[PDB]
């Protein structure tokens, strides 16, 4: 079952005395006329932000609550109990029965089975309300005990709840339960939200009445005036603001295809020891289209996934290219050993680009053997990352400098691959392209294809036109820019037209319907009905009597054909009255 609170769950926000003073507060309250669960006699509930909790009986079936996140061991929880003696607050790590309770001989307490690591102890019909909240490691408890003249139904009325306890625990809470005394020989749960209330203080300092300032237009007016009686008139109470849904973002097509099509499709690559190195500049490089050219044999990157490179941007891209064996592709990797990855190429350990490699046995190898690819094997030291050595000096191995004539312990530094088409993979020619990116300080270079969503119209939207960020309704235009102008401005300098980069059409930008909200009341001493004016808003975009005026959209009043003396002035010749009531 569910039930309706009426005006319930008001607590004194803090100490500090006070008398007749319609004082205004912002806090966590139980909104007026709320949807409170009903329980009879129970299960694990949430907490999520404070709790209202009433209960009704003459016996005592409700014997405290249990709180926490897991209601077991492995994390801490609170336990608040009351046998026929008195209250027992306690904070340990427990092991709670999934259905914990206490009996009524009169032997009881099948509640838990563990009391480890206790960090806090304490020991020592009817309507009993409680408000539980938990802020900054303090667990606050307000309470009130009113006598009903019923037995177990939620009554109506006003009664403010006075603070009881304060516990500096530190405990996290996400769930709570209840405890009941069995048979061996009715309760509600509200939740609290951040509201703003207007409390009326007595001359002794007690809260006697309140106003929830977000219930209806009358209450928002009472809050705006800081009173409990509004006299006839018309009052500005707040503001409206048509919210914008979605948000398009469309840039221009792609010009500089960014020519990978000759670094991957060149007729003749470089050898490895004098490896090629291209530098790419300002272009539109689509990495996913490069990814599925559908012939590769290694596509591996370390700094970044390839598909999420389609929405970054860099300053400079280096693309090295060469040709090596089959069994040496494992050397083109960060932190390797072996000739290649130590003689004709070295990667740094914090690499970021993609290594790409594929087979080209049918193109670079030939019967008799293509011997035109040279690789270095002799060097007096290792190499830096991205170093390059194109010299051809005669290396001396031994102690004897031999001076330009080879023989024992001095050799030529370069050998040649013999690429024969009757070879197994492991001596076959593989072509290798290594990318690397850098972001030094440069203004703008190669970026990706900024996903340009579809352009919508006639809806308050959040838009971006290749840099122009804004909000508003977009509409087909009938102005004519000059064919180099992107957007138009008004006097007082606000963007009011744009040109769509892709289709090149002019679109006006009008703001989102906004304005004030006014409440028309005959006075609370006459009635509590209300009418509402949305000022200069078209009455079709507001969220009976909906009536359109030159002054806005009026809701809650009927339009008649008579004409009286003016009572409450709306505007543009229109007045309102409480006559025909309504």
């Amino acid at each position: 079952a569910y039930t309706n609170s009426f005006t319930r769950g008001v607590y004194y926000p803090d100490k500090v005395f006070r008398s007749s003073v319609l004082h205004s507060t912002q806090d966590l309250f139980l909104p007026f006329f709320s949807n409170v669960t009903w329980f009879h006699a129970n299960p694990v509930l949430p907490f999520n932000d404070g709790v209202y909790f009433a209960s009704t009986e003459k016996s005592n079936i409700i014997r405290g609550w249990i709180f926490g996140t897991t209601l077991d061991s492995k994390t801490q929880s609170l336990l608040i109990v009351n046998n026929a003696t008195n209250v027992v607050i306690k904070v340990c790590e427990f092991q709670f029965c999934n259905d914990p309770f206490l009996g009524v001989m009169e032997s009881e307490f099948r509640v838990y089975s563990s009391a480890n690591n206790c960090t806090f102890e304490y020991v020592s019909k009817n309507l009993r309300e409680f408000v539980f909240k938990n802020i900054d490691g303090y667990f606050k408890i307000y309470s009130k005990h009113t006598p009903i003249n019923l037995v177990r139904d939620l009554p109506q009325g006003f009664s403010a709840l006075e603070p009881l306890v304060d516990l500096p625990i530190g405990i996290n809470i996400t769930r709570f339960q209840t405890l009941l005394a069995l048979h061996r020989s009715a309760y509600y749960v509200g939740y609290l939200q951040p509201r703003t209330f207007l409390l009326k203080y007595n001359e002794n300092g007690t809260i006697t009445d309140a106003v929830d300032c977000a219930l209806d237009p009358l209450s928002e007016t009472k809050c705006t005036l800081k009173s409990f009686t509004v006299e006839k008139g018309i009052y500005q109470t707040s503001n409206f603001r048509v919210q914008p849904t979605e948000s398009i973002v469309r840039f221009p097509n792609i010009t500089n295809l960014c020519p990978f099509g000759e670094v991957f499709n060149a007729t003749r690559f470089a050898s490895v020891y004098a490896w090629n190195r291209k530098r790419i500049s300002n272009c539109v490089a689509d990495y996913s289209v490069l990814y599925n050219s559908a012939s590769f044999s290694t596509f591996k990157c370390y700094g970044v996934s390839p598909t999420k490179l389609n929405d970054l941007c860099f300053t400079n891209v280096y693309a090295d290219s060469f040709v090596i064996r089959g069994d040496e592709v494992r050397q083109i990797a960060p932190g390797q050993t072996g000739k290649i990855a130590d003689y004709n190429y070295k990667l740094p350990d914090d690499f970021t680009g993609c290594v790409i490699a594929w087979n080209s046995n049918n193109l670079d190898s030939k019967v008799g053997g293509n011997y035109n690819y040279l690789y270095r094997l002799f060097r007096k030291s290792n190499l830096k990352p991205f170093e390059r050595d194109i010299s051809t000096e005669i290396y001396q191995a031994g102690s004897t400098p031999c001076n330009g004539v080879e023989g024992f312990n001095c050799y030529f530094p370069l050998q040649s691959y013999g690429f024969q088409p009757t070879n197994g993979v492991g001596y076959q020619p593989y072509r290798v392209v290594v990318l690397s990116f850098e972001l030094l300080h440069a203004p703008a270079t190669v970026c990706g294809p900024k996903k340009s969503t579809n352009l919508v119209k006639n809806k308050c939207v959040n838009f971006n036109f290749n840099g122009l960020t804004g909000t508003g309704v977009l509409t087909e235009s009938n102005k004519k820019f000059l064919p180099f102008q992107q957007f138009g401005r008004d006097i007082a300098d606000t963007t009011d037209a744009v040109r769509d980069p892709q289709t090149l059409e002019i679109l006006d930008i009008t703001p989102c319907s906004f304005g004030g909200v006014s409440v028309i009341t005959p006075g609370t001493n006459t009635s509590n009905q209300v009418a509402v004016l949305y000022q200069d808003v078209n009455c079709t975009e507001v969220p009976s009597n909906v009536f359109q005026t030159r002054a806005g959209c009026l809701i809650g009043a009927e339009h008649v054909n008579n004409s009286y003396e003016c009572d409450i002035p709306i505007g543009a010749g229109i007045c309102a009255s409480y006559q025909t009531q309504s």
Epitope: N292, F296, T298, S305, P306, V329, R330, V425, G426
Partner: antibody, heavy 126, light 109 residues
Framework: VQLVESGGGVVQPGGSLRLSCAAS????????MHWVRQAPGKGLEWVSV????????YYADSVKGRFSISRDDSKNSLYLQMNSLRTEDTALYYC????????????????????WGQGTTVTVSS | SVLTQPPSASGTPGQRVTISCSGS????????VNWYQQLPGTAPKLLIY???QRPSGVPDRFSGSKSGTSASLAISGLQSEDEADYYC??????????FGGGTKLTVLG
């Protein structure tokens, strides 16, 4: 272009086995090899791979340290030596050929497993 | 390293049926998928390697898609001989080949 296996049977838990797989129709220095087991009625489960051109092997984590795998291109064969079995190894074992060798670790983007054997049943118990 | 995929799919014979797989970042992120068909009793066949490339002998009813971190087989028009298990594979930088959970077919004829 064929793959046969041999070596299964019944051993008690604690024993050892030697599975073998013989291939025909291609060279072994152009392809990597896989041992893939499958419990009866259930899905597949990769066990081990050896690359072509010598050795760079990998095992699945639940079978780490217990097993060993080698190849022999003088005889065109695979050997999978199994030591200290447990009762969760009752399965068919398949000898699969991986086109384009090099552990899937280095030669990414194109590995596959094109041709398969007929499998060999092995079960354990007392 | 789990490669979650549905356990069984369905469809009338003669229309397109998709089969999905979802791996995280070491599975489908930086690697490629394969698809394997297992008719009941036989050895498994290869269907798709390198995310969309059927080898010789696979008919033109099977395709393949890889989008970011998901993959998808797409059988275009079922028939009386495609009632089998289908597995997706990956490599997982974790240093271990991973397999799918399999998916039966239920021509429902």
């Amino acid at each position: 272009v064929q793959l046969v296996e041999s070596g299964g049977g019944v051993v008690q838990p604690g024993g050892s086995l030697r599975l073998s797989c013989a291939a025909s129709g291609f060279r072994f220095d152009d392809h990597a090899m896989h041992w893939v087991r499958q419990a009866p009625g259930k899905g597949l489960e990769w066990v081990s791979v050896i690359s072509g051109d010598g050795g760079s092997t990998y095992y699945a984590d639940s079978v780490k340290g217990r097993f060993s795998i080698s190849r022999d291109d003088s005889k065109n064969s695979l050997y999978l030596q199994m030591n200290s079995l447990r009762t969760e190894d009752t399965a068919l074992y398949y000898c699969a050929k991986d086109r384009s060798y090099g552990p899937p670790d280095v030669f990414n983007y194109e590995y596959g497993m094109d041709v398969w054997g007929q499998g060999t049943t092995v079960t354990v118990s007392s | 390293s789990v490669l979650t995929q549905p356990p069984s799919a369905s469809g009338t014979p003669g229309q397109r049926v998709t089969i999905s797989c979802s791996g995280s970042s070491s599975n489908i992120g930086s690697n490629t998928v394969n698809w394997y068909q297992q008719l009941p009793g036989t050895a498994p066949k290869l269907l798709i390697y390198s995310n969309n490339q059927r080898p010789s002998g696979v008919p033109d009813r099977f395709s393949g898609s890889k989008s970011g971190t998901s993959a998808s087989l797409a059988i275009s028009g079922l028939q009386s001989e495609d009632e089998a298990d289908y597995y997706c594979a990956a490599w997982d930088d974790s240093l271990n080949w991973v397999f799918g959970g399999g998916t039966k077919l239920t021509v429902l004829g």
